[PDB]
Design a protein around this ligand. Sequence first.
Ligand SMILES: *CCC(=O)N1CC[C@H]2CCN(c3ncnc4[nH]ccc34)[C@H]2C1
Length: 271
Amino acid sequence: TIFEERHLKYISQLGKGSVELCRYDPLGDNTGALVAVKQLQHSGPDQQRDFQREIQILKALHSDFIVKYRGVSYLRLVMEYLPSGCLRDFLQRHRARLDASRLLLYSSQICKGMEYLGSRRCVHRDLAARNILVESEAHVKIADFGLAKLLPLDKDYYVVREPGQSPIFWYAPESLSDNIFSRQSDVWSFGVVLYELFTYCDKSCSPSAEFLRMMVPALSRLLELLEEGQRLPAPPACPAEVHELMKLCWAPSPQDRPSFSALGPQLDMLW
Ligand SMILES: *CCC(=O)N1CC[C@H]2CCN(c3ncnc4[nH]ccc34)[C@H]2C1
């Protein structure tokens, strides 16, 4: 649970702070285990405080569908390494091999991870295929908890001061208009993840490419589009039942969206 800095050997960059692939090699002979290590590159007590908040959240999550916390190095967050990487690239790389049943299995696993996060009063805020990791051909896990927040016991939503820095195409209308985040805005984002799964993350029909094609500031143009009732089109060859669940996740009002507890059994039935 406590990793000595001197024994964490740098291998390569895994992506964005930053996540590096390291070998925890106390024997110094290149035989030690591989770990994914996150660290900040910018000071400031706020980014440092935000980082400490993320570590406390992840350490307290225990689920087969959430990336495993391993420990800290005093500074660095150590997690399990998943060499298959993000679901977005995996889907692009394996499109000709994964069928609808497999996509439904991933959808069900993400939904179960989200149901659990909601039970912990945790709002993820950045659910997207690029933030989901692949453990194996038949198992995915939610990762990237850097924007996650815990809801106080007496309030089921949070208001952020500054608008998001993430690509705008995953945000719920209330997040775009009023910077409001909740477990219900995570359901909206999950509807975008179902879309990503069913397009195999094809860049030509991606949430950014398609919304920009359908689309004055861009944020305001997208908010206008959504408020009119316009939505992303059903992915090519998408099962009708799956497209109907996406539309429910995209209900204009947060209270009308199904909960992850309601979504789970429906995804399992389709699978
Ligand atoms: C889509 C590219 C990709 O594979 N990723 C995005 C950049 C980082 C973020 C976290 N991460 C990662 N990769 C593998 N094992 C990990 N364990 C914790 C975080 C991990 C990359 C995934």
